Amino acid sequence: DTRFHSFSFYELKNVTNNFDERPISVGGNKMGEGGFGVVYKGYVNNTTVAVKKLATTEELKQQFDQEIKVMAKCQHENLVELLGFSSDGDDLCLVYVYMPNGSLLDRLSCLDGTPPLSWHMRCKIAQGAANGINFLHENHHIHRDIKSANILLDEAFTAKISDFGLARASTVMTSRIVGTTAYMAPEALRGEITPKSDIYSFGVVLLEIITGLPAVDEHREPQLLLDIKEEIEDEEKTIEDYIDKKMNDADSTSVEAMYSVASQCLHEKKNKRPDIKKVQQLLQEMTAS
Numbered sequence: 085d086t087r088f089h090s091f092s093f094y095e096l097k098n099v100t101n102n103f104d105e106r107p108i109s110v111g112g113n114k115m116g117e118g119g120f121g122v123v124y125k126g127y128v129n130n131t132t133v134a135v136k137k138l139a140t141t142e143e144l145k146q147q148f149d150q151e152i153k154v155m156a157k158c159q160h161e162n163l164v165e166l167l168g169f170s171s172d173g174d175d176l177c178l179v180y181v182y183m184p185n186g187s188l189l190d191r192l193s194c195l196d197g198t199p200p201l202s203w204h205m206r207c208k209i210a211q212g213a214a215n216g217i218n219f220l221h222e223n224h225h226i227h228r229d230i231k232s233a234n235i236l237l238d239e240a241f242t243a244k245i246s247d248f249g250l251a252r253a254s255t256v257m258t259s260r261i262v263g264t265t266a267y268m269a270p271e272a273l274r275g276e277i278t279p280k281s282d283i284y285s286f287g288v289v290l291l292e293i294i295t296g297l298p299a300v301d302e303h304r305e306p307q308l309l310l311d312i313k314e315e316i317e318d319e320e321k322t323i324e325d326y327i328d329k330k331m332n333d334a335d336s337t338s339v340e341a342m343y344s345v346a347s348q349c350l351h352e353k354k355n356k357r358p359d360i361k362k363v364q365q366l367l368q369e370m371t372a373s
């Protein structure tokens with residue numbers, strides 16, 4: 085039950101060059117975007133920070149309040165840290181600790197020319213992300229939007245789960261189905277709210293880590309990355325056919341171990357998926373010696 089810092093809107097406007105929406109690569113401040121806001125690089129009290137400016141108005145305000153509420157309760161090595169918020173001015177802002185290496189989605193795509201992540205780094209990221217989800221499930225929270233754009237990477241490439249605006253603290257049904265289609269479990273697409281859906285979404289993240297492919301590509305066959313599990317099961321392809329070629333240190337044994345965890349997470353029947361504790365254990369055994 086943390087109490088956060090309150091920033092002035094105009095200070096956040098000032099330190100992000102008036103919310104300069106141009107990419108940082110061309111002299112602007114924009115680091116990224118979500119369906120509910122834009123992320124800007126800023127500089128407050130000599131510290132580099134990230135400012136998310138939120139863009140119905142009622143639903144957006146509830147997600148702003150939910151992010152603050154969930155962050156006040158959940159604090160862990162593998163969850164991004166909220167520093168403060170702003171609500172006095174024009175737009176709602178959320179301020180976080182700066183993640184120099186951006187999102188796992190952007191690092192897997194090598195966006196802006198960044199070097200590809202090694203298999204060694206990918207194993208640490210998968211372990212860290214599972215540890216963060218474990219902390220959330222232990223604290224009775226369902227994330228509801230696990231995806232590589234919501235796994236940030238700090239100065240040491242430590243995984244930091246982000247975006248708690250849709251998180252639910254507690255199988256139960258909702259009339260407002262939310263999440264990212266390409267990562268959603270079948271029961272989540274139907275309105276069910278359960279931590280088993282976070283496990284399924286984490287399985288799609290593990291396939292992105294192994295393959296370097298985005299969860300959805302309308303110009304690819306199959307369009308949805310989760311469909312490769314069936315191609316591999318029906319022996320039409322092997323996990324070796326899909327391994328990211330942008331690595332030089334992957335070994336078949338540990339890649340097959342990560343794939344086995346992903347396959348288990350992606351069981352269509354929610355009760356047949358492992359829980360997050362089992363996923364953590366399997367990912368630890370993957371690198372043990």
Ligand SMILES: CCOc1cc2c(OC[C@@H]3CCC(=O)N3)nccc2cc1C(N)=O
Nearest residue numbers: 116117118134180182183186187233246247
């Ligand atoms: C806003 C919390 O922190 C961040 C977000 C970032 C980002 O976000 C994409 C989507 C939308 C919002 C979300 O959580 N994921 N892409 C790239 C770099 C980011 C850096 C940071 C950072 N430096 O803290």
